[PDB]
Ligand binder design. Sequence first.
Ligand SMILES: N[C@@H](Cc1cc(I)c(Oc2ccc(O)c(I)c2)c(I)c1)C(=O)O
Lengths: 12, 243
Amino acid sequence: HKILHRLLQDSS
Amino acid sequence: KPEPTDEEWELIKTVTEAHVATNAQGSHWKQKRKFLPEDIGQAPKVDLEAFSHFTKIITPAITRVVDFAKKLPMFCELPCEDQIILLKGCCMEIMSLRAAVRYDPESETLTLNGEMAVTRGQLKNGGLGVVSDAIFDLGMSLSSFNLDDTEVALLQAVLLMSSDRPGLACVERIEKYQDSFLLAFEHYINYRKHHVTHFWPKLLMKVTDLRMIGACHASRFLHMKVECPTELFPPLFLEVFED
Ligand SMILES: N[C@@H](Cc1cc(I)c(Oc2ccc(O)c(I)c2)c(I)c1)C(=O)O
């Protein structure tokens, strides 16, 4: 978890 | 010898578009290369002033690696649990590759993140230890292969898609993904037709060289977590290597 998840989710 | 198929070519064009949009400073790097001061990492263990200067940039480096796999379709067709397992295992592997391919034998220095130029020593004392030699020894070696984006790219995928990482879910699916790239890579190699005897088999050995580097890097991580302040470990850094 945590961030990674964040990076795998951003369209951008 | 045999070459690519209209479909595999298309595969390549992808991987590449990826590695290229996720490789720092592109092929305009040597002009952003800012050599680390001679004094950081010298006459002693570790060397925190360096360990820092290194993790101070290691963050946006991993993100790139993440951004690279995100541009690979075969990747997004996997569970969010595995997509991680992969990142965690191949992150170092893909990073250090990306650096070796940037070893200037004249100056004898790698170029991390496309901004910082470090030396065998620096990198070693910095925390990687024996891995430096290993990462540099790689660089030197590769200078002969003259890998182009595509190649580096493909090599990077072959790593990403390691079906052996532990905890994986969709194993079988992945293995073929890897199988799907390996072939293409080789084919792309034939079109390239490098002037280097008994080839691919050699290139394959490099994959191993890179897996060894990563497998070792983990070990070094633990000492780093003992000989270094938890006050210098960016999260993602920990998020990635921490168990
Ligand atoms: N140059 C690459 C990324 C890249 C960035 C860094 I900081 C590197 O050094 C490390 C890595 C892990 C560590 O624990 C320590 I201490 C130092 C390497 I090797 C590679 C790119 O362009 O993506």
